[PDB]
Amino acid sequence: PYANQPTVRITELTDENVKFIIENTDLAVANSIRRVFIAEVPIIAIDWVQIDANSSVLHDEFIAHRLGLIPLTSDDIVDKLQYSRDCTCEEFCPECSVEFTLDVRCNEDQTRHVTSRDLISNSPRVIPVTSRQDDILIVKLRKGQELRLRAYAKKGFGKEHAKWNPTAGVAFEYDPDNALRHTVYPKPEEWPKSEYSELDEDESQAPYDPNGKPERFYYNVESCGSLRPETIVLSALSGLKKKLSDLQTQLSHEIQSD
Amino acid sequence: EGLIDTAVKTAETGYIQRRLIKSMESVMVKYDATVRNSINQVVQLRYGEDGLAGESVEFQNLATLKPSNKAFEKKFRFDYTNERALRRTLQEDLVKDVLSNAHIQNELEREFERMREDREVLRVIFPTGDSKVVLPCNLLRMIWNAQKIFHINPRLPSDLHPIKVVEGVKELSKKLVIVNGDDPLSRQAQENATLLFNIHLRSTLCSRRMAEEFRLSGEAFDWLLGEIESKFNQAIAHPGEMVGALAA
Amino acid sequence: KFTKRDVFLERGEVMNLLMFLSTWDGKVPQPAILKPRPLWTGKQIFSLIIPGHINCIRTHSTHPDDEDSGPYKHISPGDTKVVVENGELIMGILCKKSL
Amino acid sequence: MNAPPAFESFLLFEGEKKITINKDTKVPNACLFTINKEDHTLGNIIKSQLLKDPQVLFAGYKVPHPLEHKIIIRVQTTPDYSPQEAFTNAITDLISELSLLEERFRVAIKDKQEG
Amino acid sequence: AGILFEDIFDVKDIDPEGKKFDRVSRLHCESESFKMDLILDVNIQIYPVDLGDKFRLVIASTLYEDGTLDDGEYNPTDDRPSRADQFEYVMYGKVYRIEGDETSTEAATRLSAYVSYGGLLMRLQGDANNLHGFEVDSRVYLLMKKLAF
Amino acid sequence: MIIPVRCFTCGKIVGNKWEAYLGLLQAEYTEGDALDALGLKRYCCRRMLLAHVDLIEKLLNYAPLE
Amino acid sequence: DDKIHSRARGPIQILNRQPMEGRSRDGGLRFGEMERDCQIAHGAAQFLRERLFEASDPYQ
Amino acid sequence: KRITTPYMTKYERARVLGTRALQIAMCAPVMVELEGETDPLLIAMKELKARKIPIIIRRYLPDGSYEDWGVDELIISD
Ligand SMILES: [Zn+2]
Ligand SMILES: [Zn+2]
């Protein structure tokens, strides 16, 4: 009547994605961890743009929309900043936000390519993905136009908006061989073998297994560039643990009050 | 072609419906249990020639319709000579009563004669042998529900004398009234209106079928009569219902 | 597809489906297959959805006509001839003819 | 024009409780836990963890309406084991398992880098 | 006791009219002593069975030895003795029709119990002597165990 | 009108690849090879470089001044 | 958003004192004759008279 | 010598419930103990179930005559 002892094994560690495997765990925990990977992951992003002079051809809101989708590295800044909603001051304080500025005006004859590199941030570590591969093209300006504005970044998670979605695409998969029969193939021979399939090329699918629980969940968390993959996993685990702790505290208070 | 057909239908059916609705917009069922119009002109002495709402009516079948003369005799007569069959169906304390007593035999003979008369009436009224008919109360469903509730277990000898069934049916034939009044014309109209339903009730509830296929007990039969009367009462057409608009 | 003969559910799925029942009496029905593992059946779960003690008989869309006359009338190989007693599905597959 | 904002999915409103206990009357030892501003993330793991415990006769959640941010969890244990302590134990052991999983993942990562 | 029926059987034909479903098949079995037919429907997926295999089918009204007539509800937390401990395939259903070759004068000689285990049917056709314990609208079990022989 | 910043389905950044895609297509490479040369595995992110229409050029043709 | 519309004693016409017509003019929906026939079929005379007099154009 | 049906039609039941609800909403005395509710329509329904509505229905006949039926006199359908 207690929990289990899951095991972890990393198969590929790179600076763009990680492929780890979790064994001896329930399917619900795995799916919840996935949904947390996608939705509930603190990360910094643009959420407040003040446009002062925009003579481009696109809409006034188009600039803000594109700026909202530009990732920002937050390897060691997201854990320090606090949510703007829970701040105890006025105006976007640097202790709970990061300021940006963009002032580009096409003067020469050739057309400008306003990229993310023009976003001059006040903080050193909070910069768009341009450290170490072109830069995110914002808009194109021509001789006579300009784009002056300044925006602030705040902490948020994907559940609020897609801008705070660090993971590009999580490849969640378990039981490569259709052993638990969770999916019935009308013609198994017509389907290809999964990447993690241990079954030989002769047999189409593994035989049935009545007394068998789902284990060996495969993951392929792919970072967009802002947060590192392993960092994303650690943040997700910490956030889920915090949510459970808060729920436990609320339940204890409710029981004591009754 | 299909699109053009749909367009013309969408334009013609509206006018058809409008004309149908503007011709029977004042017809209704007054509290005198009769259908009239704004000029108080009687169009039907009883709504739908019976005076029943169209919501509480289900398709049924007439067992005593389109039989064979030999089969009809061996399904609604309740032979009182084969004592072995009676012991199999009725209990020991009823076989002697149905044998010795001749009043029960005369009553059963009269019931079979009335059943034959009803069969002749159905044949002369429903030509081409159409068993599928619409009536308020689905007696088969009610009998099945009684069996499933009271746990009839149709294998053991049931305790239900045929006279009980006969008297119960006669009383239910009296309780279900449509044309109130003791006037001879009133009674004639009541018999005419509630004619098919009574024929169906008699055909389903008999002395033989009740003791061979249903095997209901006294309490079960009483509950069946109560349910039938309550459902028929609820099935009556509510006065003040705009039947003209419903028909349109 | 939920009322076919070849439908089996585990305790987790059954208890998850019962949550979406506004008239559940609060008692888990006896599984149709106790051993080697508690497995419920689609018809058994659907019985709890039927209120009261209803009794009716209906026929399935793919019901072969040459079945009532011959044997296997009350036991249909194709899982047809819907039969409901005491508001519990017993035989047949539900379709538009019955729902 | 009437689209709700994005903070109403996780943030509590003034006066709304995060969790409310309500005892059921149809069967003994059965309570429905109603959670506010949550989704399947925080109910499916608890459902499974409760399923692990043998003393829990029934366990399962639901979503009264997808647009509404609320989930009801119904738990029913043996008469000698109240559902409150069952929920508490499920949360506690789940937290312990997640912490252990995090530690194992961290050590595996630190060993993977040049090792 | 509550043993409504007890007899050994053997498989002789599976899905004669072609396997319709994918997890259920017809088992046209026969007895060895009472000479009674059997059209049991077992879950071939979890409990595979081939031709020629024998099993000890025992229709029991309850799973307890003392016979306390359980109400009927899933209560795994129970330490009481259970007859299922020596059977590899148990089911729970409710007989709904007892057909027989009855007549207007002489009692029936061969009955036919039709029981539905929530969708899985079974016809225990045979003489009318050993089927005295079957009554319409009553809960029953199966309790079958394959014989190694 | 302009290349999006991220893929609608997946979410991977694709805004910083339009110029590289055009350059690779211009040099010698074809589309089927350039897409996997840039690092686009999933087929959902490959539509952003194949389906996208570059209408910002026509808009820039209407220069306000000079 | 371009189709959603509501009304609560909005502006009235000048010829026949009845609600306006059109979402832009902030008008009410038309209670067509077919709706009247349906309401008569339901026998809800009170609701019909309310819709046709009380919330349409009261006058003494 | 009343010949109208002894059952309450749905139309009459609905109208009586509505009228009693309107009267209750206009600060009128109730005819049943309130278990802690406030909606006048619910109170009217409870009174109808308790057969204590002080209203009598006058069913007009086609000829011109009428019959006065009391709510506590005839049988209620629902
Ligand atoms: Zn601040
Ligand atoms: Zn994509």
Structural domain count of chain H? 1
Q: Is F2 within any annotated ligand binding site?
A: no
Chain A positions in Cβ-Cβ contact with residue D55 (cut-off 8 Å):
1
F53 is in an annotated binding site: no
Which residues have a Cβ under 8 Å from the Cβ of D30 and sit 6 or more positions away? Answer: C26, D23, D24, D58, D74, D75, D76, D83
Domain ranges of chain D: 1-115
Q: Which long-range contacts (CB under 8 A, 24 or more apart) does G34-37 make?
A: G37/B21, G37/B25, G37/B245, G37/B248
How close does chain D come to A180, measured CA to CA in Å? 18
Query: Residue F10 annotated as binding?
Result: yes
Q: What are phi and psi of E103, to 5 degrees?
A: -130, -175
- Which chains would you list as touching D if contact means 3+ CB atom pairs under 8 Å? A, C, E
G39 in Cβ contact with G48 (< 8 Å): yes
What are the two backbone dihedrals, phi and then psi, of residue C35, each rounded to the nearest 5 degrees? -110, 155
Rounded-to-integer distance, Cα A136 and Cα F16, Å: 4
Q: Which domain holds residue C19?
A: 1-99
CB contact under 8 A, C16 and D57: no
Strands C56-58 and A18-23, by their bridges, are unpaired
Is residue F44 part of an annotated ligand binding site?
yes
HEC string of A77-136 equals: CCCCCCCHHHCCCCCCCHHHCEECCEEEECCCCCCEEEEHHHCCCCCCCCCECCCCCCCC
Contact between A176 and A194 under an 8 Å Cβ cutoff? The reply is yes
Token pair in block for residue E14: 């599976």
Assign residue H57 the CATH number of its domain. 3.90.940.10
Q: How far apart are CA G51 and CA G35, in angstroms?
A: 11
Residue H36 to chain G, least CA–CA distance (Å) = 30
Q: Are D59 and D29 in contact (CB under 8 A)?
A: no
Q: Which of residues 120-159 of B touch E (CB under 8 A)?
A: 148, 151, 153-155
Written as six digits, the tokens of B39 are 């000029």
Residues with CB under 5 A from ligand 1 (ion): A 87, 89, 93, 96
| Chain center to CA of A103 | 29
Q: State the method.
A: cryo-EM
Nearest to A197 by CA among A218, A182, A183, A221: A218
**Lookup: tokens for C53:** 């003690």
Residue A144 per-residue DSSP state: T
Domain range holding H78? 1-78
H18–G43 C-beta distance less than 8 A: no
Cα(F2)–Cα(F58) distance, integer angstroms: 11
Class of domain D1-115: alpha beta
D77-108 burial, b at 16+ Cβ within 10 Å, e below that, comes to bbeebebbebbebbbbbbbebbeebbebbeeb
- Tell me the residue ranges of DSSP E strands in chain G: none
Distances (CA, A) of H6 to A252, B198, G25, H2: 61, 22, 53, 9
The encoded tokens of residue B8 equal 């013309």
Question: What is the A232 CA–ligand 1 centroid distance (Å)?
Answer: 25
G contact test, residue of B21, B31, B238 with most G CBs within 10 A: B21
Contact predicate B125/B198, CB 8 Å: no
Written as six digits, the tokens of A49 are 């743009």
Distance from Cα A222 to the centre of ligand 2, integer Å: 12
Distances (CA, A) of H2 to C60, H6, H8, H60: 51, 9, 14, 11
Chains E, C in contact, 3 or more Cβ pairs below 8 Å: yes
Distances from the Cα of E63 to the Cα of A68, C32, E42, E80, E139, angstroms: 66, 14, 19, 10, 11
Task: Report which residue type is found at A109.
Answer: D
Q: Round to whole Å and give the CA distance between B60 and H72.
A: 37
Binary contact (C37, E84; C-beta < 8 A):
no
The span from the CA of E7 to the CA of E56, in Å, is 6
Position of tokens 């026949």?
G16
Look-up of token digits 């029991």: E60
Q: Is there a contact between C56 and B141 if contact means CB atoms under 8 Å apart?
A: yes
Interface check A136 vs F, CB under 8 A = yes
Query: Is there a contact between H7 and B36 if contact means CB atoms under 8 Å apart?
Result: no
* Residue E31 CB-half CA count within 13 A: 17
* Chain D / chain E CB contacts < 8 angstroms: 7
Q: Do C25 and D26 touch (CB under 8 A)?
A: yes
Amino acid at B246: L
Asked whether A140 and A92 are in contact (CB, 8 A), the reply is: no
Q: Which helix (H) or strand (E) element contains residue E37?
A: strand E37-43
Counting every residue written for chain H, the total comes to 78
Dihedral angle over CA of A141, A142, A145, A151, nearest 10: 10
Positions of chain breaks in chain G, given as the residue before each break (C to N > 2.5 Å): none
Q: Across chain E, which distance is largest between two alpha carbons, in Å?
A: 51
CB atoms within 10 A of CB E66: 10
Tell me how far apart the alpha carbons of residues C77 and C82 are, in angstroms, rounded to a whole number.
13
Roughly how many angstroms between the first and final C-alpha of chain F, as a whole number? 23
- Whole-number Å distance between alpha carbons of D3 and B2: 41
The one-letter amino acid code at G24 reads S
Evaluated on CA atoms A220, A224, A229, A233, the torsion sign reads negative
- How many domains are contained in chain E? 1
- CB-based contacts of D94, cutoff 8 Å, min separation 6: A3, A29, A244, D45, D46, D49
Q: Does A3 touch chain D (CB under 8 A)?
A: yes
**Chain C nearest-CA residue for D26:** C26
Q: Which of A133, A116, A123 is nearest to A66 (CA)?
A: A116
Give percent helix, percent strand, percent coil of chain D, each to the nearest 5.
40, 25, 35
Which pair of tokens denotes residue A24?
A: 């001896």
Sign of the torsion angle spanned by Cα atoms B47, B52, B56, B59: negative
Binding-site members of A for Zn(2+) are 87, 89, 93, 95-96
User: Closest Cα to residue F64, out of C50, B172, C4, A56?
Assistant: A56
What's the gap in Å between A96 CA and the centre of ligand 1?
Answer: 5
Candidates F5, F17, F42; nearest CB to A70? F5
Tokens of E54: 């024998």
Q: Determine B/G contact with 3+ CB pairs under 8 A as the test.
A: yes
Question: Checking DSSP bridges between strand C82-85 and strand D19-23, what pairing results, if any?
Answer: unpaired
What is the rounded CA–CA span in Å between residue F64 and residue E23?
Answer: 73
Domains parsed from chain F with CATH numbers:
1-66 (1.10.10.60)
E98, E105, E136 member nearest B85 (Cβ): E105
Beta bridge partners of residue C82, listed in sequence order: C58
Per the DSSP assignment, residues forming a β-bridge with B34 are B30
Which CATH number does the domain housing residue C21 bear? 1.10.274.100
Backbone angles phi and psi of D97, in degrees to 5: -65, -40
Domain that holds residue E105: 5-148
CA–CA gap between residue G51 and residue G33 (Å, rounded): 12
The answer to whether residues A22 and A206 touch, using CB atoms and an 8 Å cutoff, is no
In angstroms, this model's resolution equals 2.9
Question: CA–CA separation, E99 vs E102, rounded Å?
Answer: 9
Q: What is the SS3 string spanning A51-90? A: EEEECCCCCHHHHHHHHHCCCECCCCCCCCCCCHHHCCCC
Distance of CA B74 to the CA centre of its chain: 22
User: Cα separation of D38 and D64, whole Å?
Assistant: 12
Q: Return the structure tokens found at C93.
A: 């597959």
List the one residue out of B101, B104, B99 whose CA is nearest residue B84.
B99
Interface of A with F in 62-81 (CB under 8 A): 66, 69-71
Please, what's the b/e burial string for D14-46 (b: 16 or more CB within 10 A of its CB; e: otherwise)? eeeebbebeeeeeeebbbbbbbbbbbebbbbbb
Q: How far is CA E109 from CA B24, C28, E57, E102, in A?
A: 65, 40, 22, 7
Work out whether strand A146-156 and strand A102-105 pair parallel, antiparallel, or are unpaired: antiparallel
- The residue ranges of DSSP E strands in chain D, in sequence order, are 19-23, 30-36, 56-62, 70-77
